[PDB]
Amino acid sequence: KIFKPEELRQALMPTLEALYRQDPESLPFRQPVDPQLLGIPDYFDIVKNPMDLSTIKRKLDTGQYQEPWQYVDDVWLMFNNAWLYNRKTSRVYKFCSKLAEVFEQEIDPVMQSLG
Ligand SMILES: COc1ccc(CCc2nc3cc(-c4c(C)noc4C)ccc3n2CCN2CCOCC2)cc1
């Protein structure tokens, strides 16, 4: 099936909006991890493919996703990066886990309607 950028954006943006609605949970995910301001030079060594809410939002806005599982994969890459890098006791780790809860709840009827 041919997935038009405008179609994917209309159907998938509400699932990302749900993630953005999460306070305090989305706050560290709204913008790309800055290893310079954070003082974590080992970040890009561990995280080969950084992902965040603004990058996923930009990819939807710019027609970078050709098919819906690519969007789902980037949302999971964002979750997997935070769980990989951060300690189990951190805010970011517990916050990531809450975003995973929300995403799972939102994405299912959406993926069921697209194919
Ligand atoms: C609300 O939750 C927090 C969590 C941590 C901190 C300490 C600073 C901080 N520690 C961060 C770690 C990460 C991050 C992700 C996500 N994955 O690996 C690392 C590493 C990302 C951003 C981070 N930041 C800035 C967060 N601010 C929030 C206000 O809006 C602008 C962004 C402050 C607030």
Method in brief: X-ray
Q: How far is 34 from 113, CA to CA, in rounded Å?
A: 36
Q: Which residues, 6+ apart, have CB-to-CB distance to 106 below 8 Å? A: 14, 15, 18
Residue type at 111?
A: M
Residue type at 102?
A: V
Q: Which residues, 6+ apart, have CB-to-CB distance to 65 below 8 Å? A: 3, 5, 8, 12, 59, 71, 74
CATH number of the CATH domain containing 47: 1.20.920.10
Q: Residue 21's domain spans which residues? A: 1-115
Is the separation of the CB atoms in 34 and 74 below 8 Å?
A: no
Q: How far is 66 from 5, CA to CA, in rounded Å?
A: 7
52-79 burial, b for 16+ CB within 10 Å, e for fewer? bbebbbebbeeeebeebeebbebbebbb
Pocket of ligand 1 (CB under 6 A): 24, 27-29, 33, 38, 40, 82, 85-86, 91-92
Is the separation of the CB atoms in 31 and 55 below 8 Å?
A: no
Domain count along the chain = 1
Distance 30 CA to ligand 1 centre (A): 9
Q: How far is 81 from 32, CA to CA, in rounded Å?
A: 12
